[PDB]
Amino acid sequence: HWGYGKHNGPEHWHKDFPIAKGERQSPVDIDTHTAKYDPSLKPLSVSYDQATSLRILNNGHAFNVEFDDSQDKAVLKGGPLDGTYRLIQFHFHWGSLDGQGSEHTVDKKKYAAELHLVHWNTKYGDFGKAVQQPDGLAVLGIFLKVGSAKPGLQKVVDVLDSIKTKGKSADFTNFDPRGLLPESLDYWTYPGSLTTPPLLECVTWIVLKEPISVSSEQVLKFRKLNFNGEGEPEELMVDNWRPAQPLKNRQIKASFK
Ligand SMILES: [Xe]
Ligand SMILES: [Xe]
Ligand SMILES: [Zn+2]
């Protein structure tokens, strides 16, 4: 169906997914001058100690690293969240050039890429149920800039060659997502949506202020993936990011300063 091309990209999504023009769409630009510190925000708690990765796959839009979410072995809580959210998967959005790639932007600045760690509200029983709730998901967003290599990302990079085309997957166990986090947990938060169809407005966004650094060698590997399946014409998987959407009547709160 949809994609990131000129004929099926973000500008076309609204036809099959009318909520694309909704009141709480993501991503959005973060204006640091208007996103003010909220002294009522509680400390963010990221507990990934017992994370249990299962596999990594190419869904034709990006690559997902799936986790076993049967227990509270990897959860996100605190911050703006009411309750506990279980980690189910993470994926990235990146560009064809270093100057673009992230979905969220800070004072209009675009980063080379953006990592999204997806979690669902345990009060709803399972992911399917949660996604149809305004407070069903919590996505932790982390910016990536090019510089020093990120050791915690190498395990991922080293297996991308096995899932080059759409539809391929491979077992991916013992991956520790803690290796993808920056030093600081300072963040900005606002009510939003999934950034890809169905674009459901069920997400509480938590975007970290501090980006992590990854090497050019690492980003280059991401850019070698393909949107296409095995056999069809090669279509490099690059620029799989949705542009900033209107903030509308929303507020972006800062956990710091
Ligand atoms: Xe569904
Ligand atoms: Xe990347
Ligand atoms: Zn995403």
Curated annotation (Swiss-Prot):
Result after altering residue 59 to L: Reduced activity
Origin species: Homo sapiens (Human)
Protein family according to the UniProt entry: Belongs to the alpha-carbonic anhydrase family.
Keyword list, A-Z: Acetylation, Cell membrane, Cytoplasm, Disease variant, Lyase, Membrane, Metal-binding, Osteopetrosis, Phosphoprotein, Zinc
Outcome when changing residue 139 to G: Weakly impaired activity
Protein purpose: Catalyzes the reversible hydration of carbon dioxide. Can also hydrate cyanamide to urea. Stimulates the chloride-bicarbonate exchange activity of SLC26A6. Essential for bone resorption and osteoclast differentiation. Involved in the regulation of fluid secretion into the anterior chamber of the eye. Contributes to intracellular pH regulation in the duodenal upper villous epithelium during proton-coupled peptide absorption.
Listed EC numbers: 4.2.1.1, 4.2.1.69
Record annotation: effect of changing residue 62 to S: 2-fold decrease in enzyme efficiency, as determined by kcat/KM ratio, and efficiently inhibited by chlorzolamide
Effect of residue 2 to A: Impaired activity, not rescued by 4-methylimidazole (4-MI)
Protein name: Carbonic anhydrase 2
Entry binding sites for Zn(2+): 91, 93, 116
InterPro entries, per database record: CA_dom (IPR001148), CA_dom_sf (IPR036398), Carbonic_anhydrase_a-class (IPR023561), Carbonic_anhydrase_a-class_CS (IPR018338)
Catalyses which reaction(s): hydrogencarbonate + H(+) = CO2 + H2O; urea = cyanamide + H2O
Gene Ontology molecular function, alphabetical: arylesterase activity; carbonate dehydratase activity; cyanamide hydratase activity; zinc ion binding
Effect of residue 116 to E: Strongly reduced activity
Gene transcribed to yield this protein: CA2
Main EC class the enzyme belongs to: lyase
Involved in the binding of some activators, including histamine and L-histidine (site feature) positions: 89
